[PDB]
Amino acid sequence: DLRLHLLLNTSVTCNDGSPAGYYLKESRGSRRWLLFLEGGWYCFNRENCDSRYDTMRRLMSSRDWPRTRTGTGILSSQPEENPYWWNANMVFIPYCSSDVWSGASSKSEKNEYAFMGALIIQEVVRELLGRGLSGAKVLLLAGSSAGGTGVLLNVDRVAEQLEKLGYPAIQVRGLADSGWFLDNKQYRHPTEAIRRGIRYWNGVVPERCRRQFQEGEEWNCFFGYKVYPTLRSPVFVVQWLFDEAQLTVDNVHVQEGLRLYIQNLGRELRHTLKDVPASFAPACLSHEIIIRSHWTDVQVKGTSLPRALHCWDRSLHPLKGCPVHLVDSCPWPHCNPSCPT
Ligand SMILES: CC(C)COC[C@H](CN(Cc1ccccc1)c1ccccc1)N1CCCC1
Ligand SMILES: *[C@@H]1O[C@H](CO)[C@@H](O)[C@H](O)[C@H]1NC(C)=O
């Protein structure tokens, strides 16, 4: 089990001003550290954040968090469940800021809620340095859904933080699961929600991407295919070709018009990954993968995700029989037989 620690700096808070935190299981024989960002949508104004506080309160407050959590999938310490990194130091960071991990604003006389996602990540890193992270060789910042987008927005800032604190030997990398979206045409009649959220949250984006798009256009940096080329840290992208959250935003819930729409979406997703050399993109209708207990079961071209990640590790020391770029070419959901049921 992973054990809860609330942040010693109690000014870095969840939405309601309660302290943020992290769950930790140390592995003293290992120099690998895995820091996982939880997902769970977001809120973007007073009225919809109040609604979230009523029925999704664990995503806005630490007051009701349990003392422990069980690590699953890539967070499991059992080699049978996690062939990739079972001996690593494991960290699960709960999502309690509702800001896609981008916020840097405190509660105040003008602000009913605090949106501190970007500061929460930085404070977790700083406090872990006193608990063994100072000896790491590799820090993998991973995340699913809003947490996958969170990796893209924060991985280079973690790398810059460790350099400035005097730890240039730690190699920072990212693993972004189910956070690679397209700003496409909907099937029936959403970027406005991110534009509004950034202002409400005092949201921050990576500096090189910010300098490209400029004031008022920072929402562009929330889209993987636009922010990825600006990043310097190595990032492995995991994305279903027919992601259910993508389809929900597109108003898809089969005749010719919908058939063409769905096939075009898979082709467009595949196009955006052509120049992403570490990627895993199966032709399945689903959402999230890395913390599911049966994450080992899916394969692309005969290679599982745990294998592809191991081959990525080797490449950062092409490899014979050890591929890292794995994108399905078949054009319809479940054309890959290994898709989840
Ligand atoms: C997992 C969540 C963070 C996903 O949020 C999806 C979008 C926000 N977009 C905008 C978007 C526009 C077009 C197509 C897809 C998404 C978004 C964009 C990039 C990264 C995160 C969220 N919302 C709009 C209303 C409801 C959800
Ligand atoms: C606590 O965090 C806040 C916000 O990140 C920061 O301004 C402050 O310096 C921190 N306090 C200490 C003692 O580091």
Radius of gyration of the chain (CA): 19
Q: Which amino acid is at 113?
A: Y
Rounded Cα distance between 238 and 84, Å, is 15
Is 287 annotated in the active site?
A: yes
Is 64 annotated in the active site?
A: no
Q: 140-149 b/e with 16+ CB inside 10 Å = b?
A: bbbbbbbbbb
Give Cβ neighbours of residue 115 (< 8 Å, ≥ 6 apart).
15, 97, 98, 99, 102, 103, 104, 105, 200, 201, 202, 203
Rounded Cα distance between 15 and 59, Å, is 8
Rounded Cα distance between 171 and 162, Å, is 9
Q: Whose CA is nearest to atom 2 of ligand 1?
A: 41
Residue with tokens 């930085």: 122
- CA atoms in the 13 A half-sphere facing the CB of 198: 16
DSSP string across 220-274: GGGSHHHHGGG--S-EEEE--TEEHHHHHHTT----HHHHHHHHHHHHHHHHHTT
Q: Which amino acid is at 153?
A: L
Tell me the best of 11, 13, 105, 202 to mutate to test the pocket of ligand 2, counting ligand atoms within 8 Å of each CB and taking the most. 11
Q: Whose CA is nearest to atom 10 of ligand 2?
A: 9
Question: CA torsion, points 147, 290, 306, 236, in degrees to nearest 10?
Answer: -20
- End-to-end, the C-alpha distance of the chain in Å comes to 28
Give Cβ neighbours of residue 113 (< 8 Å, ≥ 6 apart).
15, 16, 49, 60, 98, 107
Q: Whose CA is nearest to atom 20 of ligand 1?
A: 222
Q: Give Cα 83 to chain centroid, integer Å.
A: 20
Q: 264-267 contacts: CB < 8 A, separation 24 or more?
A: 265/182, 265/184, 265/241, 266/241, 266/242, 266/331, 266/332, 267/331
Tell me the best of 145, 192, 194 to mutate to test the pocket of ligand 1, counting ligand atoms within 8 Å of each CB and taking the most. 194
Give Cβ neighbours of residue 280 (< 8 Å, ≥ 6 apart).
236, 237, 238, 239, 300, 305, 308, 326, 327
Rounded Cα distance between 217 and 146, Å, is 20
Locate 333 and state its tokens: 């959901």
Locate 320 and state its tokens: 């014979």
Rounded Cα distance between 204 and 139, Å, is 22
Question: Does residue 42's CB lie within 6 angstroms of at least one atom of ligand 1?
Answer: yes
Which ligand sits nearest to residue 194's alpha carbon?
Answer: 1
Closest to 41 (Cα-Cα) out of 123, 182, 149, 201 = 149
The answer to whether the beta carbons of residues 247 and 287 sit under 8 Å apart is no
Q: Give Cα 29 to chain centroid, integer Å.
A: 27
Alpha-carbon separation of residue 211 from 180, 194, 221, 230, 232 (angstroms): 21, 18, 10, 10, 15
Question: Does residue 12's CB lie within 6 angstroms of at least one atom of ligand 2?
Answer: yes
Q: Whose CA is nearest to atom 6 of ligand 1?
A: 249
Question: Does residue 252's CB lie within 6 angstroms of at least one atom of ligand 1?
Answer: no
Residues in the chain: 341
Q: What is the position in ligand 2's atom list of the atom closest to the CA of 122?
A: 5
Rounded Cα distance between 303 and 300, Å, is 5
Q: Whose CA is nearest to atom 14 of ligand 2?
A: 9
Pairing of strands 235-238, 242-243: unpaired
Alpha-carbon separation of residue 214 from 112, 130, 181, 208, 220 (angstroms): 28, 37, 21, 10, 10
Name the structure determination technique: X-ray
Rounded Cα distance between 59 and 38, Å, is 10
Q: 114-117 contacts: CB < 8 A, separation 24 or more?
A: 114/13, 114/14, 114/15, 114/16, 114/17, 115/15, 115/200, 115/201, 115/202, 115/203, 116/12, 116/13, 116/14, 116/20, 117/150, 117/201
Give residue 201 CA to ligand 1 midpoint distance, Å.
16
DSSP string across 62-131: STT--SEE---GGG---TTT-TTTTTSEEEEE---SSSTT-B-B--BTTBSS-B-HHHHHHHHHHHHHTT
Is 156 annotated in the active site?
A: no
Q: Is residue 79 classed exposed, middle or buried when 0-12, 13-18 and 19+ CB atoms within 10 A define those classes? A: exposed
Question: Does residue 104's CB lie within 6 angstroms of at least one atom of ligand 2?
Answer: no
Question: Does residue 119's CB lie within 6 angstroms of at least one atom of ligand 2?
Answer: yes
Tell me the best of 6, 8, 9 to mutate to test the pocket of ligand 2, counting ligand atoms within 8 Å of each CB and taking the most. 9
- State the resolution, in angstroms: 1.5
Question: Does residue 10's CB lie within 6 angstroms of at least one atom of ligand 2?
Answer: no
Question: Does residue 114's CB lie within 6 angstroms of at least one atom of ligand 2?
Answer: no
Q: Check 18, 76, 97, 145 and give the catalytic one.
A: 145
Closest to 334 (Cα-Cα) out of 254, 236, 277, 216 = 254
DSSP string across 274-336: TT-SSEEE-S-EE---TTSTTTTS-EETTEEHHHHHHHHHHHT---TT---EEE----STT-S
The answer to whether the beta carbons of residues 76 and 86 sit under 8 Å apart is yes
Locate 46 and state its tokens: 């007073």
Neighbours of 38 (CB within 10 A): 18
Which ligand sits nearest to residue 243's alpha carbon?
Answer: 1
Helix intervals (H) in 108-190? 117-129, 146-164
Question: Does residue 118's CB lie within 6 angstroms of at least one atom of ligand 2?
Answer: no
Q: 98-118 b/e with 16+ CB inside 10 Å = b?
A: bbbbbbbbbbeeeeebbbbbb
Beginning with the edge strand found earlier in the chain, give each strand of the sheet holding 32-37 in spatial order: 68-69, 2-6, 21-25, 89-93, 32-37, 138-144, 171-177, 235-238, 279-281, 325-327
Alpha-carbon separation of residue 60 from 10, 126, 196 (angstroms): 15, 22, 19
Question: Does residue 194's CB lie within 6 angstroms of at least one atom of ligand 1?
Answer: yes
Rounded Cα distance between 56 and 53, Å, is 6
Closest to 87 (Cα-Cα) out of 144, 33, 35 = 33
> Which residues make beta-bridge pairs with 2?
69
Rounded Cα distance between 26 and 20, Å, is 20
The answer to whether the beta carbons of residues 96 and 62 sit under 8 Å apart is yes
**Gaps in the chain following residue numbers (C to N > 2.5 A):** 189, 253, 317
